[PDB]
Amino acid sequence: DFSRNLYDIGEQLDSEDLASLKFLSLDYIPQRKQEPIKDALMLFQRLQEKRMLEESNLSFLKELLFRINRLDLLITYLNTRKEEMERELQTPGRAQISAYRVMLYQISEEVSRSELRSFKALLQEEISKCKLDDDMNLLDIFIEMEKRVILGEGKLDILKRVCAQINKSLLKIINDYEEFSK
Amino acid sequence: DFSRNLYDIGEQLDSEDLASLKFLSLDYIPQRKQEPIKDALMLFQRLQEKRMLEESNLSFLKELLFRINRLDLLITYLNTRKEEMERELQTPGRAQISAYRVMLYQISEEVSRSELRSFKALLQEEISKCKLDDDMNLLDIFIEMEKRVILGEGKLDILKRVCAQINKSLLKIINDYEEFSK
Numbered sequence: 400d401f402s403r404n405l406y407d408i409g410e411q412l413d414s415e416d417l418a419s420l421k422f423l424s425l426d427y428i429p430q431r432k433q434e435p436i437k438d439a440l441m442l443f444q445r446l447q448e449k450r451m452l453e454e455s456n457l458s459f460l461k462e463l464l465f466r467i468n469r470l471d472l473l474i475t476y477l478n479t480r481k482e483e484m485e486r487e488l489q490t491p492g493r494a495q496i497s498a499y500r501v502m503l504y505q506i507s508e509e510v511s512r513s514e515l516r517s518f519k520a521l522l523q524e525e526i527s528k529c530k531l532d533d534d535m536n537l538l539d540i541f542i543e544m545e546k547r548v549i550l551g552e553g554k555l556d557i558l559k560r561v562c563a564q565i566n567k568s569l570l571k572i573i574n575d576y577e578e579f580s581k
Numbered sequence: 582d583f584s585r586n587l588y589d590i591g592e593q594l595d596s597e598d599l600a601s602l603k604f605l606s607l608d609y610i611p612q613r614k615q616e617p618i619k620d621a622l623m624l625f626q627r628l629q630e631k632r633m634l635e636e637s638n639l640s641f642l643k644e645l646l647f648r649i650n651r652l653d654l655l656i657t658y659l660n661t662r663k664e665e666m667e668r669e670l671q672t673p674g675r676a677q678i679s680a681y682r683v684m685l686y687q688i689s690e691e692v693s694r695s696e697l698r699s700f701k702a703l704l705q706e707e708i709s710k711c712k713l714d715d716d717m718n719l720l721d722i723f724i725e726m727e728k729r730v731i732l733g734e735g736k737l738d739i740l741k742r743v744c745a746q747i748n749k750s751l752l753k754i755i756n757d758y759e760e761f762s763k
Contacts, residue, residue, distance in 0.1 A: 422720045430724055499734050502758040506744070506751050507719040514747055519713050519722065521743045523705040526731075531701040537689040538604045540704065542612055549708075552681050561703045562688070565696055569688050576684040 409439035591621035601649045
């Protein structure tokens with residue numbers, strides 16, 4: 400019944416819900432230990448292993464389902480209303496997920512497609528410290544690469560590794576030049 | 582007359598042609614010395630300073646105009662046909678621009694808009710070694726950041742520097758979390 404119910408809940412959860420749930424459970428289950436988990440039921444049972452989910456303890460489950468906005472599953476399988484979960488989670492100490500994970504997840508919620516792509520681009524820029532706006536051309540990029548000492552008369556490795564994933568003609572130009580350096 | 586002709590040629594060249602010409606002249610004029618050059622005439626006179634451009638020496642000029650495919654200016658102002666320039670530049674030793682700069686410039690020629698954006702992205706990936714692609718979501722990115730030890734409970738600098746350039750609501754979530762940890 401109970402485990403059967405858990406399977407029932409697990410059946411209605413897709414890949415996105417699985418990823419979100421695994422992220423929200425990082426406070427108890429390490430990220431490397433999550434890769435064997437391929438569905439929601441494995442996660443549920445892993446939670447049972449840490450005694451955070453049993454017939455007498457459905458709190459963390461309800462919290463998880465509430466965070467990912469699966470209120471339908473709460474009503475259907477757990478008989479739980481949104482008002483109850485809110486009233487509970489506002490009460491201090493009753494929250495079992497850290498404010499950090501919650502914060503990151505809410506950020507992930509607020510972000511759209513374009514905002515996500517922009518997030519990747521901006522992150523890459525903040526890591527490499529080489530902001531490549533659409534103002535500069537390929538020549539300026541070459542200059543920046545020579546400045547970074549990653550491009551030169553005898554250093555074409557990165558240029559080739561980039562051009563190979565774009566167009567064979569470019570790589571053919573590079574090789575033509577490189578073989579004329581006999 | 583001669584200087585008049587040089588001004589005439591310089592007048593017909595736009596910003597793109599200027600950038601290309603300055604790039605093709607890096608073998609004689611350092612990059613840091615090219616920033617004062619705001620038009621083609623300054624570049625021409627700078628070439629005159631290095632005695633690479635005079636009434637009896639229009640070789641490097643014709644070569645430059647040929648490389649950037651301004652054959653119209655060659656015909657109009659220099660009385661030079663494409664066949665002549667090809668036949669001349671094919672003859673060894675007569676070329677004054679290194680094969681390296683020529684190679685890079687031809688690469689810049691063959692690349693279109695989308696190929697350029699792809700070049701920026703791929704370069705960023707090859708530099709930061711953090712290939713993300715459009716396959717993974719924001720949560721996987723967060724995991725990668727924690728793996729990179731650039732994101733944590735007490736390390737929100739980069740997350741904030743990214744989110745600030747995306748949406749104030751995200752930054753408001755971050756600050757809300759950060760101020761509730763009193």
